[PDB]
Amino acid sequence: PLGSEVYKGDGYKVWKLEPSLGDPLELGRKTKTEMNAMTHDEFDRMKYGDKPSKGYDKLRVLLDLMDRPRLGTTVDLCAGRGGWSELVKDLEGPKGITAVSLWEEEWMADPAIHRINANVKHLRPWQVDTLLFDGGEAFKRDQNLRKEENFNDSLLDAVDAWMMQPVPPRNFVIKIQVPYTQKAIALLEKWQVKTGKGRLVRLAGDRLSNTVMYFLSVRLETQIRGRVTTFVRELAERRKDRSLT
Ligand SMILES: Nc1ncnc2c1ncn2[C@@H]1O[C@H](C[C@@H](N)CC[C@H](N)C(=O)O)[C@@H](O)[C@H]1O
């Protein structure tokens, strides 16, 4: 019998993403343009307190997908209100966490968690057991597409320094807000070479109004370009399905 292996246990939690043919940047820009043109009706129909934020439960699902590793010294980059840091603190205590964010957003997590008020694009890395990053922003419709792409590429370039240091993080959870840019795909491929690990996932039930994926330190899953292509094609189809009659 399959036994306990049944519970971990991928089927329910993330999209199946086998690689397919196509240009992910062209397809991503196409579906973003279509979404920008949607009516209130269309857009609304598919755009759809215990914790410091809704991020706590999200990180719990991701860490379970990773077989619940021991976290050790952890940096939480772009910590915001602290949902991810609070999860780490509940798991292992406050001592091993450093939270980095621009609080200029107020901290809703344990005040015992060490915090650094800094731009993650300026802060230089240090050696950690676990690297967490939940930065990234979806832009509103009125703006040009390349602006959103460049903003999120810049954040990813900040994470790159943490990943490429001489002793990289053993565990990592990296939010990829815009995964179909040339830079995002090149960065993910590079981190797979550096670490020998890493799989890009789309979480089931994430909002269709965004293009968010998560890069997780589970076993290597390669062909990232084709899997992003599959993701953006399927996303455009599910946006169409939801926005319609
Ligand atoms: N360049 C930057 N440096 C530091 N923090 C940033 C930067 N850009 C955005 N942020 C912050 O990153 C946060 C992103 C949030 N999604 C984090 C949520 C957090 N994971 C939670 O569970 O509550 C926002 O609070 C932003 O204020």
UniProtKB/TrEMBL annotation:
Molecular function (Gene Ontology), one example: methyltransferase activity
Keyword Manganese: no
Principal localisation: host cell
Compartment list: Host nucleus
Residues that, per the record, bind S-adenosyl-L-homocysteine: S53, G82, G83, W84, E105, N119, V120
GO aspect biological process, one term: viral RNA genome replication
GO cellular component, one term: host cell nucleus
Residues the record lists as binding S-adenosyl-L-methionine: S53, G83, W84, N119, V120
Keywords associated with the record: ATP-binding, Helicase, Host nucleus, Hydrolase, Membrane, mRNA processing, Nucleotide-binding, Nucleotidyltransferase, RNA-binding, RNA-directed RNA polymerase, S-adenosyl-L-methionine, Transferase, Viral RNA replication
Name this polypeptide is given: NS5-like protein
Species annotation: Alongshan virus
Covered range of the whole protein: 42 to 294 of 914
